[PDB]
């Protein structure tokens with residue numbers, strides 16, 4: 001089984017214990033670690049943070065302790081305008097230029113592959129995405145002729161039905177990608193008057209309008225579109241989404257007035273790292289959606305939808321029963337990486353729980 005873990009560049013700037021550098025990553029924890037967000041300048045892949053070359057080096061040294069560890073660099077991300085990806089891919093000259101610049105860059109900094117994070121191709125981009133994936137892979141095959149181990153190619157793909165039908169030709173890109181990470185944790189998100197969980201595993205006999213917004217549906221749909229199971233990777237979040245209640249109501253459908261207040265360390269409205277949630281729980285009321293199989297918590301006028309060891313182990317048993325290639329975890333830096341916030345002096349509790357299940361069978 002594969003355990004793909006993302007590390008984000010900007011996590012280095014969080015204060016105090018929130019600060020996270022690649023050197024805090026357990027070499028034997030994941031099978032693949034993806035460094036988050038390289039940019040594109042002059043139509044060529046390029047660094048993002050002023051100290052990326054130093055962190056690339058710090059990350060790739062983990063391979064000295066664990067020889068089998070693979071690393072990849074992800075291009076794009078949320079702060080990268082989709083429009084920008086759209087312009088690169090649309091013109092063969094710009095696309096070829098970007099493609100030809102990747103292997104050398106990757107080889108220089110010691111990466112084993114490229115992860116594409118075009119966060120949301122539109123109806124007009126579908127055809128160019130296919131082209132980009134095909135040509136990129138073809139270039140990686142040619143490059144391997146030089147006697148060095150072929151570069152890996154992966155992509156982070158939306159798990160939203162409408163999004164999938166709009167910009168992805170799954171049957172086509174699946175045959176060129178080594179693996180596909182399903183972003184099965186964005187099924188709700190401060191943008192509609194109510195409270196709801198963003199990463200439910202199951203539909204939940206309760207509501208019906210959105211029978212599509214759960215991991216189970218996303219997975220079945222991909223398999224139906226032609227994506228081989230042995231190439232699918234289910235995303236498991238290590239963070240939570242917070243809301244500010246509009247009333248004293250906490251149950252399903254409770255009104256919302258906006259995202260929850262920022263965490264002491266992540267300082268981003270609507271989000272909380274697992275380690276900030278562990279602190280949040282003291283004095284909070286905990287609950288669990290039976291049907292969706294995920295928990296949530298409330299305190300004062302704050303409502304949090306998150307994942308704990310049990311929900312995460314559950315999602316992992318599930319991907320196993322469906323024979324998928326493995327799991328993807330978004331943000332090692334959002335997990336209790338120091339292991340000093342969540343009681344048990346265990347480092348990376350959420351990620352470890354996933355790893356344990358994957359190792360049982």
Ligand SMILES: *[C@@H]1O[C@H](CO)[C@@H](O[C@@H]2O[C@H](CO)[C@@H](O)[C@H](O)[C@H]2NC(C)=O)[C@H](O)[C@H]1NC(C)=O
Pocket residue numbers: 039040041042047048049
């Ligand atoms: C990534 O590279 C792009 C393009 O080289 C950067 O964007 C430019 O930033 C300058 C100064 O902020 C602007 O004058 C240009 O108009 C921008 N170009 C585009 C297409 O947006 C960007 O600064 C780089 N990213 C980072 C974080 O370094």
